[PDB]
Symmetry: C3
Subunit: 272 residues, 3 copies
């Protein structure tokens, strides 16, 4: 069933690209600008790959970019799939399985997030150090295939210690402040209330988003090393909370994206 769908997706991709990627990449809302850094051999539309969904959130372009960044073979999802769209988490996380099958060792994931920690600034890039999953579904529910990963994956260090060390070293070299923090995943699609933001803060979250955790969960099950970043697109201070609109979010995401466009190319040669 699952691994057979994985094998078919990868069998096809091999026929469109002879590359063996070291790093797999997932790029978030308003962060699609990052693909411009890649020397692209091929862009594979999601339809040409057996068992792939559809990207419908604005700014998510929806295609599989294959090539090289600083001479490091890579595969990048420019635009992702979201639970709030109506995709199952199996559908959301299938591209991760495919990256594993292609032979990537590391998944880099980026997203746009609300800043709950008051020490954050607008357009900060945060290094994800840990997460809290508050989504009402889990991508590993179902029969487990031990050829894919264990029944009970350990989550004591889902974000690679060595990768984040490198990410910090680069940030400092570039003179960029990248704080580390905890990412909380919620379903969406609505934004949070004032009272929900107070609760998430109390529970330990520094940023909140509607993605990423499902993919991280699947990456860890599959034995991939993870580096995640959040761009703080809006501030979520419940005692001074302003209405958020998608277009402002995309603007601030672009400024954070400019910073990742500096960081990521310096990071990749140092982690692979």
């Amino acid at each position: 069933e699952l691994k057979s769908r994985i094998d078919q997706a990868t069998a096809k991709i091999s026929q469109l690209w002879q590359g063996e990627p070291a790093v797999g990449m997932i790029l978030g809302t308003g962060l699609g600008g990052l693909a411009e850094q890649i020397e692209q051999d091929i862009a594979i539309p999601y339809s040409d790959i057996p068992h792939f969904p559809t990207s419908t959130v604005k700014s998510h372009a929806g295609r599989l970019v294959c090539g090289r960044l600083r001479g490091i073979p890579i595969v990048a999802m420019e635009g992702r799939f979201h639970y709030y769209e109506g995709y199952s988490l199996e559908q959301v996380t299938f591209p991760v399985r495919v990256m594993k099958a292609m032979g990537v060792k590391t998944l880099l994931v980026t997203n746009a997030a609300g800043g709950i920690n008051p020490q954050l600034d607008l357009s900060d890039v945060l290094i994800i150090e840990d997460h809290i999953n508050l989504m009402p579904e889990n991508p590993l529910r179902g029969p487990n295939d031990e050829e894919l990963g264990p029944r009970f994956p350990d989550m004591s260090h889902p974000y690679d210690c060595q990768h984040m060390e490198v990410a910090r070293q680069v940030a400092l070299e570039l003179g960029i402040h990248c704080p580390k923090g905890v990412f909380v995943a919620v379903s969406g699609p609505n934004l949070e209330t004032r009272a929900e933001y107070r609760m998430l803060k109390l529970m330990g979250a520094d940023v909140v988003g509607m993605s990423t955790v499902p993919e991280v969960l699947v990456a860890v099950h599959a034995g991939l090393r993870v580096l995640g970043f959040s761009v703080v697109t809006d501030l979520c201070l419940p005692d001074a909370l302003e209405p958020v609109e998608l277009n402002k979010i995309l603007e601030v995401a672009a400024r954070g994206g400019a910073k990742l466009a500096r960081l990521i190319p310096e990071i990749l040669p140092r982690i692979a």
Copy 2:
């Protein structure tokens, strides 16, 4: 994408029994159906006769759409609601809100029965809902978004209307009734909460707990309706001294709070509509 057609199919049928253009919609909760008597009624439409409307299976929920006038203000009321815990999707639960918005309603007034977690509450208090926490495991807006109904990512910084709640307080005060404001937490039910759960809910910042309302509010906000919300405290939820609760006691307390609402609502409607 076929929802907009479901909405029109239901709306047109409703118009074939009623002439009105309601300015306010109202949803009445457990033990609070009696509030419908306040309306000078043109017709009461059973949910059976409306395309795509669910059925109410909970005790005291009458299952009818009351259309009429309250204090000269045209109005539509759900006498009895639908809950997630009955087996309805949140799309089903919140369908009437879409229908109400289509009918032309500007404001949604929602009422519910709730457990009192804040120890300053008293039995039969009418709380003015100032904000909420959604602990339900589904979201009624999940799935494709139709931009003609609302935005993909609705803002929730002010789900309960500021001016509506200000009017609700002034009326309370001129009537001499204490209506505290606070935070409503929606959980799925159908079981009531454990002692350890009540402690956690309080710590999370909830003042009252219920098994409804939040889905309808989410959909109301997405649709651009202004919301006014009230919880009647039907049972006290203090974990160091929690007594068994039974449905029949909850209905009795609900009635004393309803009688308070039956005084508050007709005085509020003309000042917000």
Copy 3:
């Protein structure tokens, strides 16, 4: 509404294999299946031969219904259970509890393997479950309610029976075993929790965390059964000093707590009401 039919069909087949009238039902968790050797069996029934029973797929869960006498008490024991994370609905998970009620059991004894969140716990501790927090994303009682089976809104003020736990403690002290009381939180799994998540579960008031049990307790309470619950602490979950966990170690610690329950349970059973 057709669940009774499924219940009768399963209770009929079981009477065909065993004419016993069980006083107690027992659910044996991960690595605890050895507790079934305490039963002087009359019959072991594979779940596959019982109408409507699912299949146990986690290691250590044998997937047999064990019927007999445990120190003189007629009993039915699930040697191995079902889990939401396996892809079962909670209706399927808890069907065996409905069956137990229909066979006549008055008390459900539930066991599980858990993570120890409270820093006062030790490895292999056997904890008396005093209350729970349900963080599962589905509820086994959602859907139409059959009054013949239980109330629409069960009370959860004392899910774990006060007298049963008092007897568990009396017997623990007689045997010289330390059995602390605490709150169990149920999460879906199947991944273990992150460090941030362990902190949050502590803050919410959890003492131990597991991936089962709560759905069965819910149904038990709905069905009028008295519940006695025990968690075996199989791994410690301190976020500032968290070590990776493998199922293999868990199973080894479970057996050590399992040895202790092997002593407790046969002493407790003849003493509870």
